[PDB]
Amino acid sequence: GKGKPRGLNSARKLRVHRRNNRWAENNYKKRLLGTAFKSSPFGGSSHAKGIVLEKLGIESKQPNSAIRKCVRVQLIKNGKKVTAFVPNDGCLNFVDENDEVLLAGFGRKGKAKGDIPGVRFKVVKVSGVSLLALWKEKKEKPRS
Amino acid sequence: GISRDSRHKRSATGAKRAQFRKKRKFELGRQPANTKIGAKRIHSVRTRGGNKKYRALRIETGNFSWASEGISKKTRIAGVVYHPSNNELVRTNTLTKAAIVQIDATPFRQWFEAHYGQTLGKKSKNAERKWAARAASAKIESSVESQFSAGRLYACISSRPGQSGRCDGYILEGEELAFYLRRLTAKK
Amino acid sequence: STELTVQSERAFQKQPHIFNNPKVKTSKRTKRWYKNAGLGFKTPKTAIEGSYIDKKCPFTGLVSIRGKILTGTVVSTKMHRTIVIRRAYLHYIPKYNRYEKRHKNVPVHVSPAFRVQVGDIVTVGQCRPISKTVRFNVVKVSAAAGKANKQFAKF
Amino acid sequence: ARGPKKHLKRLAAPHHWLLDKLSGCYAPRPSAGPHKLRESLPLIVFLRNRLKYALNGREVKAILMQRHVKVDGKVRTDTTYPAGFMDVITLDATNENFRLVYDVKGRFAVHRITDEEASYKLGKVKKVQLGKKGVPYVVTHDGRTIRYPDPNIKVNDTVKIDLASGKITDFIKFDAGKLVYVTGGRNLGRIGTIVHKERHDGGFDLVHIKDSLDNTFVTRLNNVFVIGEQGKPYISLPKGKGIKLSIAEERDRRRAQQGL
Amino acid sequence: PDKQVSKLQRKNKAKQL
RNA sequence: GACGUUUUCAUUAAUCAAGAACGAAAGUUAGGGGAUCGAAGAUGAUCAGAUACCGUCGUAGUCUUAACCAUAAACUAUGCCGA
RNA sequence: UUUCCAACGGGGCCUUUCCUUCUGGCUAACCAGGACUUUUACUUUGAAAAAAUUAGAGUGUUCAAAGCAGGCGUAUUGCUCGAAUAUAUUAGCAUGGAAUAAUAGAAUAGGACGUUUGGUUCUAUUUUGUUGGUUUCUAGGACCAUCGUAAUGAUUAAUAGGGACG
RNA sequence: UAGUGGCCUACCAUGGUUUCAACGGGUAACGGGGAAUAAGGGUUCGAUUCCGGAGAGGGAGCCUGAGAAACGGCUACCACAUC
RNA sequence: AAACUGCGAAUGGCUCAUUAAAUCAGUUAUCGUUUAUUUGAUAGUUCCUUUACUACAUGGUAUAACUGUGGUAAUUCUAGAGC
């Protein structure tokens, strides 16, 4: 009988049956409780800009072997402190602390590209000016 | 704004209804007329479509009609002696629809003594037949007769003195006078 | 209960504007207005030959029949001059190509001409709004008990 | 929403006006009068863009404030005036005169006519009743209240009403064989000698109706419109006579007949 | 006591923020 | 329970939300004996962690009486009526 | 299209296959008229399903995306094609279809074929004489006294259960 | 009341809804054609040019009028806030 | 010109916070109800004694703009008189 009712009055069961088994699916429970709204410091966004707090202290969740020139940042739409990242790395010279970024994930909402805790967000545009025409030696690549 | 909307109620499962739109003008309810005896100021009111309604607060005089005969006389009341809905209303002497009143006899008996030739209470050769050819026709009921000696009858009201301006009584008789005299001795 | 000579209320129940003639007393002795209900309904012979009044009776009172007519079975006659029917039906769901048992309770006024029991089969018609819940009025009683008057006296 | 409406949006017009989707934002909402809002066809939808005697609205009102056009024997002068079904339009132009009866498409067209039948009009007597001072009267479909009719005329028949003064001249009963015309629903602009009635106490009354090519269809009875006998219309019906050719045989008429 | 931070239609009360 | 029957009901039926009985070992209150060994424990151990397996007494417990509990690898690791 | 051989369809009718009774138009073709060889679940054909979206003629917007537009000579003062249809289940409203599932008649035979008979509720379209107190025979329903009617009611005892007894 | 009505009101009756899920709670919920889809079914979204509903900062309230509980109308409260 | 009068200003435009048998959608019903407008039809009886105190050869007021004396810190504030 394959563990299920079939008879053509039993739909009362079935749409109450799957109703209690959608919660075993992962993104269903993630979605319909507003957990992306009660958490996830973007708050369901796609980008966020915020001041750089400071230079970052490396705590090994493996592996990229250097002090990765990363930036402690704290946003301004929320104010929730996240460790960040710059690609084309190096050039630690060209913006102070308490200065602007534009953040965006790594590809999995980040979670792993180097040995740094919670580093999941590529910086896109510091202070409104870009990085890709600023690693292109038109402008210059920032510091923390 | 006394609304007569249904959505302020509690639905029959017991559920409280959530709040919908603001109150409306097309679903309005006004004050009671609460119409009484002694003078007349009939405040007309203005309704939807122009369509004026009168409202007979202080009604005094009305076209009351005794049904078993077929004649309708302007008359004036003593007061009320019974009210079906609320027994407050006899104290205030409240006229409404379907109250029970005691009305004047003198139009009815001034018609009776000149039309019947019975002349109860107390013109040439053709016109005695008006008083003589009513064989078995000049007989009112004995319980109808006793109200004439007091000079005040028993009548009920079929008008809307809140919504028409009028008071049109009908003189109670027979079966229904027996019922409201059963109740009337029990309440008055 | 009501004790025909039906005027147990504070106000004389009568047919409105129907006038039992008190001066002439003759071989009439019954002034009872009644109407057809429409739609091919046999009127109940209580209503022709009864003393009850019932303003909202579709045979003697100021209501009418329109639009809808609905079957069902009685339940809970513990109110006065009204019953409640409950209609069962099968809701449909196309996710599973299947059905679902549901029911609805209709509070419907009943006449004093008919006399019913919880478990009979009713046919009602729509009327003007009577109370909050009631929009219907009992008009045919298809009681299908099965003739148990002397059925226990069996061979 | 706080009383009536005064604007009709473009795309909220009925489809039988056949306004173009672009070139504007609104529709010329018909005024109240002798017809429904939903099957009105006002004056400017007739003039400027189905006859093209005017190019835009100010030139339409140039006609209408010059007392030329007539709608059923009077000198109607309003732009959004609902000259609807059966209304004769007479011009004081080069004197070409028109009717208002649909095609089979459920849409009005240009139909020029004679002067035998420009003189009068018709109407489904939607009510016969006994009004004041005990006077019988009849109410046709548009607005007319004709007094003192034939008492053997009942509801759902039709009349032959004049335009000079509103005088009923003759009528048509309701039975089978009656050449008919539908006003509403789906089979709008059809024709074809009623088969029979269906009573249905308290409900709709539908009717079974043939056509010329013997193709039955069932309307409702509040759209049936009896105007004849076995092949006897009382107007001059347009080219095509209302019988529904299918879209397979207008790619055989417009494509295989006029297209060689 | 009760970890009862639910019923946040008065999350709109935190338009206080 | 099986089996036999040319006895009686003539569909009284399958599982199962809710609900109800029972329930190893162990454990839980109030009693009987108190023979047997014996989780803990009191002793002797006894040399480094050949390894700490040894040994001896042991309150309760094991056995039952008026009651619980409602736990197993309660496992043939396989729900119950059909072919 | 004259058409020999077989084949796919439903009907008129028939081998108890009732396909009914009801009679004016009538000498059942079909139209009023009294009952269905039971009521729901199901499905089949209509009707309602706004216009804008989605599918497509036709149109050289230069192809297009678009748009519903437009084409033709002696251009001699005009002629003339259009602007379809498809779709949208439940719910609601109409009829067959005759399985499926449901609901069970007639175990009293206090029931049908009762074309039957005393008697009960009856009775006025009436004809009565024009209209209302006093009546019948009488058109149209029901049962007791009551029996005449054809073929008068027990679908099974389950390799499904419950008993007895051995 | 424009009118049905527990819409009130005066006396009565003790009902009504529900595990066929009442009631309560949450919605980052304005409802209907649309979208991404594309074997089919399913999935998620729909503030948005059209229809219907609602509001003119939040709740009340009333006038004129056929029509408004109207805010490029009015009175008051509440939150603001100009010379 | 202005001003009286009338109609318009209840349409449009915007926004989606509310709202979960609510809205809305399809279907109903009003034998329970209002409706300016439009269109069609519709007042011999109006001195309510039409036996009259009459003016129907048409009877009265009240006023804006016009004017001409002004105040306001400031408003589309308005005052006093004469038409």
UniProtKB/Swiss-Prot annotation, chain A:
Signal peptide: none annotated. It comes from the Eukaryota. GO terms for biological process: maintenance of translational fidelity; maturation of SSU-rRNA from tricistronic rRNA transcript (SSU-rRNA, 5.8S rRNA, LSU-rRNA); regulation of translational fidelity; translation. SUPFAM superfamilies: Nucleic acid-binding proteins. It is found in: Cytoplasm. Belongs to the universal ribosomal protein uS12 family. Component of the small ribosomal subunit (SSU). Mature yeast ribosomes consist of a small (40S) and a large (60S) subunit. The 40S small subunit contains 1 molecule of ribosomal RNA (18S rRNA) and 33 different proteins (encoded by 57 genes). The large 60S subunit contains 3 rRNA molecules (25S, 5.8S and 5S rRNA) and 46 different proteins (encoded by 81 genes). This is Small ribosomal subunit protein uS12A. It comes from Saccharomyces cerevisiae (strain ATCC 204508 / S288c).
Swiss-Prot record, chain B:
The modification Phosphothreonine is found at residues 61, 106. It holds the Pfam family Ribosomal_S8e. The keyword Ribosomal protein applies. It is found in: Cytoplasm. InterPro entries: Ribosomal_eS8 (IPR001047), Ribosomal_eS8_CS (IPR018283), Ribosomal_protein_eS8_euk (IPR042563), Ribosomal_Se8/biogenesis_NSA2 (IPR022309). PROSITE patterns: RIBOSOMAL_S8E (PS01193). Gene3D superfamilies: 3.10.290.70, Ribosomal protein S8e, subdomain. Residues 1-30 are annotated as: Disordered. The modification Phosphoserine is found at residues 65, 68, 72, 85, 142-143, 146, 149. Keywords: Cytoplasm, Phosphoprotein, Ribonucleoprotein, Ribosomal protein. One of its GO terms (biological process) is translation. One of its GO terms (cellular component) is cytosolic small ribosomal subunit. GO terms for molecular function: structural constituent of ribosome. PANTHER family: 40S RIBOSOMAL PROTEIN S8. Present with 15900 molecules/cell in log phase SD medium. Belongs to the eukaryotic ribosomal protein eS8 family. Component of the small ribosomal subunit (SSU). Mature yeast ribosomes consist of a small (40S) and a large (60S) subunit. The 40S small subunit contains 1 molecule of ribosomal RNA (18S rRNA) and 33 different proteins (encoded by 57 genes). The large 60S subunit contains 3 rRNA molecules (25S, 5.8S and 5S rRNA) and 46 different proteins (encoded by 81 genes). This is Small ribosomal subunit protein eS8A. The gene is RPS8A.
Curated annotation (Swiss-Prot), chain D:
It comes from Saccharomyces cerevisiae (strain ATCC 204508 / S288c). Component of the small ribosomal subunit (SSU). Mature yeast ribosomes consist of a small (40S) and a large (60S) subunit. The 40S small subunit contains 1 molecule of ribosomal RNA (18S rRNA) and 33 different proteins (encoded by 57 genes). The large 60S subunit contains 3 rRNA molecules (25S, 5.8S and 5S rRNA) and 46 different proteins (encoded by 81 genes). PANTHER family: 30S/40S RIBOSOMAL PROTEIN S4, SMALL RIBOSOMAL SUBUNIT PROTEIN ES4. InterPro entries: KOW (IPR005824), Rib_uL2_dom2 (IPR014722), Ribosomal_eS4 (IPR000876), Ribosomal_eS4_C (IPR032277), Ribosomal_eS4_central_region (IPR013845), Ribosomal_eS4_central_sf (IPR038237), Ribosomal_eS4_KOW (IPR041982), Ribosomal_eS4_N (IPR013843). Residues 41-104 form the S4 RNA-binding domain. CDD domains: KOW_RPS4 (cd06087), S4 (cd00165). GO terms for cellular component: 90S preribosome; cytoplasm; cytosol; cytosolic small ribosomal subunit. Belongs to the eukaryotic ribosomal protein eS4 family. The modification Phosphothreonine is found at residue 114. GO terms for molecular function: RNA binding; rRNA binding; structural constituent of ribosome. Pfam families: 40S_S4_C (PF16121), KOW (PF00467), Ribosomal_S4e (PF00900), RS4NT (PF08071), S4 (PF01479). Present with 573 molecules/cell in log phase SD medium. It is found in: Cytoplasm. The gene is RPS4A. One of its GO terms (biological process) is cytoplasmic translation. SUPFAM superfamilies: Alpha-L RNA-binding motif. This is Small ribosomal subunit protein eS4A. Disulfide bonds: none annotated. PROSITE patterns: RIBOSOMAL_S4E (PS00528), S4 (PS50889). The modification Phosphoserine is found at residues 31, 246.
Swiss-Prot record, chain E:
It is found in: Cytoplasm; Nucleus, Nucleolus. It comes from the Eukaryota. Interacts with RIO2. Present with 1390 molecules/cell in log phase SD medium. Belongs to the TRAFAC class translation factor GTPase superfamily. Bms1-like GTPase family. TSR1 subfamily. Required for 40S ribosomal subunit synthesis. Required for normal export of the pre-40S particles from the nucleus to the cytoplasm. Its subcellular location and association with pre-40S subunitshifts from mixed cytoplasm/nucleus to all nuclear in RPS19 disruptions, suggesting it acts after the ribosomal protein. This is Ribosome biogenesis protein TSR1. The lineage of its organism: Eukaryota, Fungi, Dikarya, Ascomycota, Saccharomycotina. The chain holds residues 45 to 61 of 788 of the full protein.
